[PDB]
Amino acid sequence: SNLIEVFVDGQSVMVEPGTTVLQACEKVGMQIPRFCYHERLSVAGNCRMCLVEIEKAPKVVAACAMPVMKGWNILTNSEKTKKAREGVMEFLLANHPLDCPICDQGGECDLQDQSMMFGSDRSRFLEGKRAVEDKNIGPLVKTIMTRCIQCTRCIRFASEIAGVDDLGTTGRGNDMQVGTYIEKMFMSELSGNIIDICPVGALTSKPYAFTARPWETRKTESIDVMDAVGSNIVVSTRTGEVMRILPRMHEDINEEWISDKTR
Amino acid sequence: EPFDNTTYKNLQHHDYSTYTFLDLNLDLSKFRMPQPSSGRESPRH
Amino acid sequence: PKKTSFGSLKDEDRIFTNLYGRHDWRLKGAQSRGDWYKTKEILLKGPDWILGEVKTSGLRGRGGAGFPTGLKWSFMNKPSDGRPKYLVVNADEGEPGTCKDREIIRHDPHKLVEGCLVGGRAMGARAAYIYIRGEFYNEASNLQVAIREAYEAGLIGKNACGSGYDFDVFVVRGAGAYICGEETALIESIEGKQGKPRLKPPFPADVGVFGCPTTVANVETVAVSPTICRRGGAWFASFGRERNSGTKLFNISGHVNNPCTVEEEMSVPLKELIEKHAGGVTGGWDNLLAVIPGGSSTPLIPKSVCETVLMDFDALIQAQTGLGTAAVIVMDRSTDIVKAIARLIEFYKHESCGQCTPCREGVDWMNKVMARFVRGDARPAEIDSLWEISKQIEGHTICALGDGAAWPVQGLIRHFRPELEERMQQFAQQHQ
Amino acid sequence: GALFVHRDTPENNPETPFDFTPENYKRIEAIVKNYPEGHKAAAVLPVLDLAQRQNGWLPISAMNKVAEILQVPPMRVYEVATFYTMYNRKPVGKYHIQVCTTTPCMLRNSDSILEAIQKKLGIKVGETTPDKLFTLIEVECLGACVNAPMVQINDNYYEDLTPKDIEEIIDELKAGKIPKPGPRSGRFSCEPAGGLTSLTEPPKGPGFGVQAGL
Ligand SMILES: Cc1cc2nc3c(=O)[nH]c(=O)nc-3n(C[C@H](O)[C@H](O)[C@H](O)COP(=O)(O)O)c2cc1C
Ligand code: SF4
Ligand code: SF4
Ligand code: SF4
Ligand code: FES
Ligand code: FES
Ligand SMILES: [K+]
Incomplete structure (x- = not known):
């Protein structure tokens, strides 16, 4: 009825009007690269890692923000698409610090993983790097903000999910910095979820700091009992010890967040 | 009335001060039409 | 009689007859010069007639991109939904x-205030916000005085110009x-947020x-609509080449004898413009190194191209540049072209919003x-690296500021x- | 010095006193009413600029005042203050001198203007004179490129400068007079220095060229 037909790599898919080019690719099984897009946050379109070619169109479109149109053929593996990804990944890593050994995100980092899969294998950056000062937003979330990639997921989450307008960007240009501006704490019953949505090690768990690595944890899918909601969780263990608690997506209960008492 | 094209007639702005712009906006308010309303006092309302 | 040599505009056909501030900018003189004349009769013919007049003139946006103004303004001309409609006048400059x-x-100022009313009536707007940069304080106050004079004279407000159409400026x-100055980042600044451009779609006319539905138009594009x-x-289209019609304001600066603003016909040869109105290059036409034909964003062109280049949208696109704002920047052979363009990159670095x-x-x-x-x-290999670094910025950003930093490089x-390798x-x- | 995080000081803390004067509260009322009902956040920029014209700079307490009256979250007012360069977040002198050194002003020797001012006031770019009268900084294009080189002191442009025209401007400001803005050469605005190449005839009057039925 109201469905429109679009093609993903020449393959027909029927989508509701208003579907984004990124969501059309989901239905054929293709996951577009992303950093700023989150399905449970508002669309931003600032990282530019989802840029994709549309056949017979000269300029690439941001897949996360662009609605599809009837008859569009999305080329996700095209030469124009792949070169867009290498360029953007090249910019994202230009000022990123060489911290992977000392960074808790190492081994479960979307910057590391998407660099391996869609980025170049080497650097041609021959300049100095940006160093940003760190900000104390409380006892539960550690900030190494030199690692931030300015996706504003923390900002959009804190505004829209947690109903707290304390995070924002200050300055502009290469010196635009995420934070609170003043010395303030982002203490909320849901504050600890910015750790998960931060795709990099800019925001990490202080209690969990330095203890383990992602590859060595055993995952046990269990239930939270700190309240009567019944949040689905993952218990990470290593050598018979509980290391941390993570949310497990359950749409009809906790979605993909947990409270800080659970975490 | 003479077409004297030899003087700069934009000399008024040399007397403006700190609140010239916002004072004019205050006088202009009596003329504006009623503003439209979205319906709520703010998006947070 | 298709004209073949363009330029030499006569003062009868000029639009900004007070460009130099030698007459009275207030309402009384502006009415003496033909502003605010039969504005009622214009507004009673309706949004369709006014738009058709703009489409016929071949007027294109004077703010940089250069989009056909008549077609652009026609998106607003649609039935309402319940939301107001607005005209945003881009005076960021x-x-x-x-x-x-x-x-x-x-x-x-009254040429603008009338263009807001005529342009607003064409699009069906209720008011016109005129965004002006915060440095232009004295200019803003003159604009406020003119808007007051128009209000007190009944030219804008309830029943503007004795027509029944209500309009605020x-x-x-x-x-x-x-x-x-970016059209969506302008809109965001009027709403009280960081001036960070928006992605499109949705387009501002949605x-x-x-x-609310909105058209953003340059000051010069709106200030010529009543004329x-x-x-x-048809009168306007009689100037300039086909598809690049009208008379354009030109800023000549840099290494010219007499840097000046002037109005001249479109398609005026670049050599003629510099020699005739600006007094020629400092040291004669043989001292010219390169010319930036339309502000920082446009690529420079060398002296060889400057010889026979016409100053319009299509001619400058052929030379791998653009008319842009028509701000002609002149550099003579004493100039350091590398230092000259490096300072532009330092400017764009300071003006990027940081969003994307x-x-x-x-x-x-x-x-x-x-x-x-x-x-x-550096090494000569980095030059082809810098070229590829620019081509990754171009076309991959949200707004065209990213483009405007690549094109200078x-x-x-x-x-x-x-010159770079040398x-x-x-x-x-030296370091050997 | 271009820091975008606030650290409380005895002179700039949340309890530092700031309140709009009763006259400036009326001006805000007209500012706010320019925008649709339900979109008061549109007034954040003008109200902050008003807070800066009353105080001369924006202390953190002034930002919280703007957030309160407009009912905007304080962070969203901190973002605007840092994003726009006209807002001063440290004390600036009574006369804030801004020299455009972008390319079109550089090609007409704006460095001579910058060197002339630095030597006269005995400061370097970004500093404030010991007695607090002057603050020198560089800036980007100020939209006065044909009249380059040019500087803005407070809300006034002084254009077509020469390394002695500016040193006269500064002498007057020290004395207490405020010199008249505009070009300091023999032209009144942007016209060609050689007495006009256009618009020399008398302007035509109403009804010239009007089409058939207009
Ligand atoms: C960085 C940047 C700055 C701009 N500055 C201006 C400006 O100062 N004035 C202007 O009219 N357009 C400016 N533009 C272009 C506007 O986005 C838009 O194209 C224009 O206002 C539309 O009006 P027009 O159709 O009359 O050209 C700028 C664009 C960019 C990317
Ligand atoms: S955020 Fe990712 S890429 Fe950056 S240092 Fe940490 S693990 Fe490495
Ligand atoms: S702190 Fe993390 S989530 Fe927030 S903008 Fe930076 S990278 Fe994105
Ligand atoms: S291209 Fe530059 S100015 Fe435009 S949105 Fe991106 S960061 Fe901001
Ligand atoms: S995921 Fe689309 S621009 Fe960030
Ligand atoms: S380059 Fe200095 S005013 Fe434009
Ligand atoms: K994280």
């Missing part, structure tokens, strides 16, 4: 080398940001300022590279590559 809008606002001032409706759509990755990181990167080329502290590499040898020899 921040493109380096560009200062045409400054003169309109302070010396022909608001003047809002910025706070320092070249990026607020969801604009306050979430095109008066003297006619290719410009937040890419423009700052190109700035660091262009700084070393100035001292020669590409122009320097395109026409002065030997400096690298000297640095190597």
Whole structure:
């Protein structure tokens, strides 16, 4: 009825009007690269890692923000698409610090993983790097903000999910910095979820700091009992010890967040 | 009335001060039409 | 009688008859010069007639991109939904080398205030916000005085110009940001947020300022609309080449004898413009190194191209550049072209909003590279690296500021590559 | 010095006193009414600029005042203050001198203007004179490119400068007079220095060229 037909790599898919080019690719099984897009946050379109070619169109479109149109053929593996990804990944890593050994995100980092899969294998950056000062937003979330990639997921989450307008960007240009501006704490019953949505090690768990690595944890899918909601969780263990608690997506209960008492 | 094209007639702005712009906006308010309303006092309302 | 040589505009056909501030900018004189004349009769013919007049004139946007104004204004001309409609007048005026809008606002303020009313009536808007940069304080106050004079005379407000159409003109001032000249980033600044451009879609004629249908138009594009409706759509198209019609304001600056603002016909040869109105290049036409034909964003062109280049949208596109704002920047052979363009990259680095990755990181990167080329502290291989770094910024950003930082670099590499490499040898020899 | 995080000081803390004067509260009322009902956040920029014209700079307490009256979250007012360069977040001198050194002003020797001012006032770019009268900084294009080189002191442009025209401007400001803005050469605005090449005839009057039925 109201469905429109679009093609993903020449393959027909029927989508509701208003579907984004990124969501059309989901239905054929293709996951577009992303950093700023989150399905449970508002669309931003600032990282530019989802840029994709549309056949017979000269300029690439941001897949996360662009609605599809009837008859569009999305080329996700095209030469124009792949070169867009290498360029953007090249910019994202230009000022990123060489911290992977000392960074808790190492081994479960979307910057590391998407660099391996869609980025170049080497650097041609021959300049100095940006160093940003760190900000104390409380006892539960550690900030190494030199690692931030300015996706504003923390900002959009804190505004829209947690109903707290304390995070924002200050300055502009290469010196635009995420934070609170003043010395303030982002203490909320849901504050600890910015750790998960931060795709990099800019925001990490202080209690969990330095203890383990992602590859060595055993995952046990269990239930939270700190309240009567019944949040689905993952218990990470290593050598018979509980290391941390993570949310497990359950749409009809906790979605993909947990409270800080659970975490 | 003479077409004297030899003087700069934009000399008024040399007397403006700190609140010239916002004072004019205050006088202009009596003329504006009623503003439209979205319906709520703010998006947070 | 298709005209073949364009230029030599006569003062009868000029629009900004008070461009130089030698008459009375207040309402009394402006009415003596033909402003606010039969504005009622214009507004009673309706939104269709006015738009057709603009479409016929071949008027294209005077703010940089250069889009056909009549077609652009026609998107607003649609049935309402319940939301107000607005006209945003882009008086940010921040493109380096560009200062045409400054003169309109302070010396022909009533040409703008009428264009807001005529343009607003064409699109069906209820009011016009005029965004003006916060540095232009004296110009903003002159504009406020003119808007008061028009209000007291019944020309704008309830039953404007004795027509039954209600219209307000608001003047809002910025706070320092070249990026607020970008049409969506302007809208965001009027809403009280950081001037960060929006992605499109949705287009402003769907969801604009306050979430309402909106057209953003340049000061010069709006300030000539009442005249095109008066003297006619066909009269305007009789100037300039086909598809590049009208008379244009020109800023000549740099290494000319007499830097000046002037109005001249479109398609005027660039050599004629510099010699005739600006007094020619400092030291004669043989001292000319390169010319930036329309503000910082446009690529430079070398002296060989300047000989026979016509100043219109299509001619300058052939030369791998653009008319842009028509801000002509002149550099003579004493100029350091590398240092000249490196300072533009330092400007774009300072004006990027920081929102999106290719410009937040890419423009700052190109700035660091262009700084070393100035001292020669590089290798010839980095030049093709800098070329590819720019091509990754271009077309991959949210707004066109990212484009505007790549094009200056590409122009320097395109026409002065030997100059870049030559400096690298000297640095190597000294440090050997 | 271009820091975008606030650290409380005895002179700039949340309890530092700031309140709009009763006259400036009326001006805000007209500012706010320019925008649709339900979109008061549109007034953040003008109200902050008003807070800066009353105080001369924006202390953190002034920002919280703007957030309160407009009912905007304080962070969203901190973002605007840092984003726009006209807002001063440290004390600036009575006369804030801004020299455009972008390319079109650089090609007409704006460095001579910058060197002339630095030597006269005995400061370097970004500093404030010991007695607090002057603050020198560079800036980007100020939309006065044909009249380059040019500087803005407070809200006034002084254009077509020469390294002695500016040193006269500064002498007057020290004395207490405020010199008249505009070009300091023999032209009044942007016209060609050689007495006009256009618009020399008398302007035509109403009804010239009007089409058939207009
Ligand atoms: C960085 C940047 C700065 C801009 N500055 C201006 C400006 O100062 N004035 C202007 O009219 N358009 C400016 N533009 C272009 C506007 O986005 C838009 O194209 C224009 O206002 C539309 O009006 P027009 O159709 O009359 O050209 C700028 C664009 C960019 C990317
Ligand atoms: S955020 Fe990712 S890429 Fe950056 S240092 Fe940490 S693990 Fe490495
Ligand atoms: S702190 Fe993390 S989530 Fe927030 S903008 Fe930076 S990278 Fe994105
Ligand atoms: S291209 Fe530059 S100015 Fe435009 S949105 Fe991206 S970062 Fe901001
Ligand atoms: S995921 Fe689309 S631009 Fe960030
Ligand atoms: S370059 Fe200095 S005013 Fe434009
Ligand atoms: K994280």
